[PDB]
Amino acid sequence: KVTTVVATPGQGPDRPQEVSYTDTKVIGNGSFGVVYQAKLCDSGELVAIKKVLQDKRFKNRELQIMRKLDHCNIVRLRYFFYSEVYLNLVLDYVPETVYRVARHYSRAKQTLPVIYVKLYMYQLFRSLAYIHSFGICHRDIKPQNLLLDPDTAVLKLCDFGSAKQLVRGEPNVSYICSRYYRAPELIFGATDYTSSIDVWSAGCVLAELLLGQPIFPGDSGVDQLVEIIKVLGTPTREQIREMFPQIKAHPWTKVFRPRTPPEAIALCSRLLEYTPTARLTPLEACAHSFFDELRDPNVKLPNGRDTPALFNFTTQELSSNPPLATILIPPHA
Numbered sequence: 001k002v003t004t005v006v007a008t009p010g011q012g013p014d015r016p017q018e019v020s021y022t023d024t025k026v027i028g029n030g031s032f033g034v035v036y037q038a039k040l041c042d043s044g045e046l047v048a049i050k051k052v053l054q055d056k057r058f059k060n061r062e063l064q065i066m067r068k069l070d071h072c073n074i075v076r077l078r079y080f081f082y083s084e085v086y087l088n089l090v091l092d093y094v095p096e097t098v099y100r101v102a103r104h105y106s107r108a109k110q111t112l113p114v115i116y117v118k119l120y121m122y123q124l125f126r127s128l129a130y131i132h133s134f135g136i137c138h139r140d141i142k143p144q145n146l147l148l149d150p151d152t153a154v155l156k157l158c159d160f161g162s163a164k165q166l167v168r169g170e171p172n173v174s175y176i177c178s179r180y181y182r183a184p185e186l187i188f189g190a191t192d193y194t195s196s197i198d199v200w201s202a203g204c205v206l207a208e209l210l211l212g213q214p215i216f217p218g219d220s221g222v223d224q225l226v227e228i229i230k231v232l233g234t235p236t237r238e239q240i241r242e243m244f245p246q247i248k249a250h251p252w253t254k255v256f257r258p259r260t261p262p263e264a265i266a267l268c269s270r271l272l273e274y275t276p277t278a279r280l281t282p283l284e285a286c287a288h289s290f291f292d293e294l295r296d297p298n299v300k301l302p303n304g305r306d307t308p309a310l311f312n313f314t315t316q317e318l319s320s321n322p323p324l325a326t327i328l329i330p331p332h333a
């Protein structure tokens with residue numbers, strides 16, 4: 001019925017408090033453990049609780065990363081507590097994901113309206129700009145990790161179980177990231193990759209939202225590679241070095257359906273690039289013309305509501321390229 005724990009607030013100083021929740025139901029199982037949904041007794045607010053076995057030999061990386069994140073497009077750590085000992089992350093509950101929503105449209109043989117593609121992708125790139133400004137790479141960007149509130153069109157990035165700060169010259173494991181969304185340098189087993197792998201994944205999500213299906217499917221690395229090559233063409237010797245069947249590149253305009261906005265395709269082509277340093281940074285993507293509509297003072301949601309927070313950039317968020325502020329923050333913001 002009612003569970004009462006002593007939990008430490010996610011943000012702010014380490015001062016624990018009694019927190020009572022109820023209506024606990026399971027909403028997900030995984031390699032990490034279990035995600036519950038519960039209701040806070042004090043406020044009626046819905047939370048997700050992610051339960052993981054605690055390393056005991058060290059501090060939990062996910063927890064350390066989440067306690068220092070504060071951004072409106074990243075799911076909020078409200079509390080954490082301990083309960084073989086387990087670490088429980090209490091997060092704001094979000095009712096949907098890009099995965100289930102994309103699933104709804106594909107099953108109905110429709111595509112998600114481009115206005116939602118713009119809103120969702122833009123917010124994803126902001127969450128990335130934010131975590132990348134700390135040197136933190138998410139390393140598992142995929143539709144199941146993109147939470148959505150369909151009423152307000154707010155997107156929140158979740159799951160920082162793979163996230164890690166990438167320091168130049170330090171090797172990192174290549175076996176991160178989920179099939180379909182893996183950068184080609186990961187497939188090739190590179191251990192010197194950069195945060196731009198997040199950008200490649202984000203481009204895969206964009207292409208999927210436009211196509212109604214994954215752009216580079218395959219149950220093996222070789223199949224994925226074959227699909228990437230069918231689109232990008234055969235990588236050059238130099239492109240390979242930066243990260244085989246000789247195939248000529250398929251014109252990007254012929255990859256998507258006829259009614260697809262050319263700005264959407266141009267954005268795709270600048271995200272999905274062999275050479276990791278040639279991909280757009282998240283902040284640059286935010287500033288891409290594909291998102292200009294979002295910066296239009298007259299824009300509204302299909303449901304009639306105002307757009308959610310889009311322009312509340314901080315100095316930290318802009319730090320990779322401060323003069324983009326002039327594009328990113330429109331006159332009416």
Ligand SMILES: COc1nc(-c2ccnc(NC(=O)C3CC3)c2)ncc1C(N)=O
Pocket residue numbers: 027028030032035048050075091092093094095096097147158159160161
């Ligand atoms: C399913 O895995 C996860 N799920 C969440 C989460 C957080 C807040 N709201 C939701 N909401 C939903 O799942 C609704 C049902 C679609 C999920 N957070 C982290 C993880 C993780 N694996 O780290």
